[model samples]
Target: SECGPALFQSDMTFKIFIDGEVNGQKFTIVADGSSKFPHGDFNVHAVCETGKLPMSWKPICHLIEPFFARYPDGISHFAQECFPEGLSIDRTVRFENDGTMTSHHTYELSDTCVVSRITVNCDGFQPDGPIMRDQLVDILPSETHMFPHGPNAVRQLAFIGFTTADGGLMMGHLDSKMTFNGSRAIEIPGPHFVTIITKQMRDTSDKRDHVCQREVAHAHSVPRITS
Candidate 1:
């Protein structure tokens, strides 16, 4: 499905849009994407609409860290092929601020006793709601991008990108991941299941150890399940 991150496609190009506020200052981040093994090239730019602030901006990159976490295929392919050598971002921290700070960051990984050492440099580098659910929006006839049409190329069980009003005239966009359940709609026959996971399941964790337990159904004849 063309609905997800275009980058996952061979010879593809895309952009990532980031928006947030830090200490009364609101900024939007945009970055160009590229990759080669453990190292990737992303020239990220941030615009503080209010100009300058009083916080640390060093941590903003985490917003996009574990980039694979957002990749559509969900740790399927690109991950393993690129690990051991991990994802590294060449970063620089700056913006008009009022505190003392420096240019240093810790790249921590692995088992136990993990922590981030931030001594603070230049002081400041700084850096919702939705409640609504409707039905399975069948894409309207006006939405050509959603389907297989009348005959040959037509599709079933349509899709939609519902638009609504919020606090401001704001927008959020991602270039390389599937949207509107498009990734799920894609068929990857039984033979290629692992092929799917490896490509999309990169660098993701809930900050806690995930436990797998068995859930037996129908007693004896039931298949025991664990995850």
Candidate 2:
């Protein structure tokens, strides 16, 4: 069978949390954000608990394009005899402050959740030591939730393989045990809504986008890592 006929709810919210040590420095980053879908376009926002939201704004937009581009057809249009895998973005951006941020972002999609591992490296922005909250915020996912697939437990064993443009073969594997659950379904009318828990810590063997992943199969305008 194929992948999706999933409709992104008209309004979606995201909460992002990152607890890890980078370059011998410890950090805990948290943020809140939302995305509004009006006619296939996503209007996104992210507000951090302490500092400015880090990273470029486009990935969040890029995150949903597959679903948006599916349009009247749905995600299955990009898949044949298999489920659509997911997206992996690897790139680095430099700032005017002389700090540079490089990230490897991988997304694994399932019916209920999308698990990700955001590996980052930053330099030139701050003094040598654990990057502070504000400095660190500048490298995190913007207000757009990092895991936007909805607040639900996700468990899956994904094996994806495809051929490259020049006729080379690529293989990808993912074992996910993650959760992206909200306090209430957007379908339920409620005053306070939040995705109370968002957790994922897993690595995929291959970083290439599944041949069927949106960026590979569809035409779009987004800056990507060329080297």
Candidate 3:
């Protein structure tokens, strides 16, 4: 039904925003990465086409592409660790066009560390639309794990980035997932009634995940001042 799809889409987007901690932060940054499909139609089509890569890749590419080329060897390692197969960055521009920018840097964690890599992309764009940026740091750890599920299922995950009092930047992330058991309802409990309860429970779970992601970000020491 229209209500179901509409509500699902709204809830999902809102969850991502809150989970990503873009709401309360002073300076917000959003990024998404994509990769080529596993099979079919992997050939080059044309340039400048609406969906064409070569042409449409120019705008965002022209802005950040140089950095990838200049630091080919280093960036290669960084990118590989972040995305094993392959990834693409598109339509990315700094929110603010201010001269000041935050860059991502890389670091190596202890051999026992779970996270394989972490890229902290800072607020480089003021609120305008121009200006290129760099990777302030890249953190490479030894390992990563998926949270286990049991009576208490995972609920959410959050990534927090902030500047320390000592003038250094830091970042950390947490993840959560949820699970449920399958059970049958009493015959007296009409199917319609069961459906209603099931739907409501699902919605509630989604909301909880959303809240958890946002709360984690807030609990961190990141300041809420605007850029």
Candidate 4:
């Protein structure tokens, strides 16, 4: 059918471990954050304790989120289909960072445990397993918990198959992953990991929004000029 309807738990804390090397530099990007839902609204602050995060990547990478939002139920039907069979998401994302990083994801879940493994260019990026700790406090001093879906961020899902009278065509692809932990209910809770990535320029375009730009679909690069 669809997701159980509660993909996000208000009181739960999700700690995402991001360990990958960008360029030749190494990184231990730990984005321990939370969720603000309706669809594509969530957060992940990088409290990088290891290598420094590249600035270009910092702006782009900090955006990763879960795919449940793409669903009408805010939960993953694909995940449900994958059930005992599980699902794997593999894609190459070219970032504005001047480099491209390909991510590999595998998901196998149950009510109690969800084994999610994500890896990028760095072979060492994958954690042995999900990390458990007091993660909320892990946010960087200068960095607050992330929320591109926050009141400050923007999102849009404009179709580019047409032209506009004013200007601009909004279209792109964002690829990312996260593992939710809770009861067998299959909630997207703790130890969440996601990437706000660029998917495709394939058949995409932009259009005017309802302003305030809340769609998060466009919440990345292009902004609608509605003034």
Quick one: best TM-score, which candidate? 4
lDDT of each: 0.25, 0.31, 0.20, 0.33
RMSD per model, one decimal: 18.5, 16.8, 22.1, 16.1
Residue 158's C-alpha lDDT in candidate 2? 30
TM-score of each: 0.27, 0.35, 0.20, 0.42
Please give the TM-score that candidate 1 achieves against the real structure: 0.27
What tens digits encode model 1's per-residue C-alpha lDDT throughout 94-153? 322222212222323232111122222233322212111111111111111112222211
Give the runs in model 1 whose Cα sits over 4 Å from its true position.
Answer: 1-9, 36-49, 64-180, 183-227
Pairs clashing within candidate 2? 45-143, 46-143, 54-138, 54-139, 151-180, 151-181, 152-180
| Between candidates 2 and 3, the TM-score winner | 2
* Order of quality (lDDT): 4, 2, 1, 3
Off-target runs (Cα >4 Å) in candidate 2 are: 4-24, 30-83, 127-227
lDDT of 3 by residue, 37-73 (tens): 1211111111111221111111121111101111111
Candidate 2 yields a Cα-based lDDT of: 0.31
Ranked by TM-score, top first: 4, 2, 1, 3
Model 1: lDDT equals: 0.25
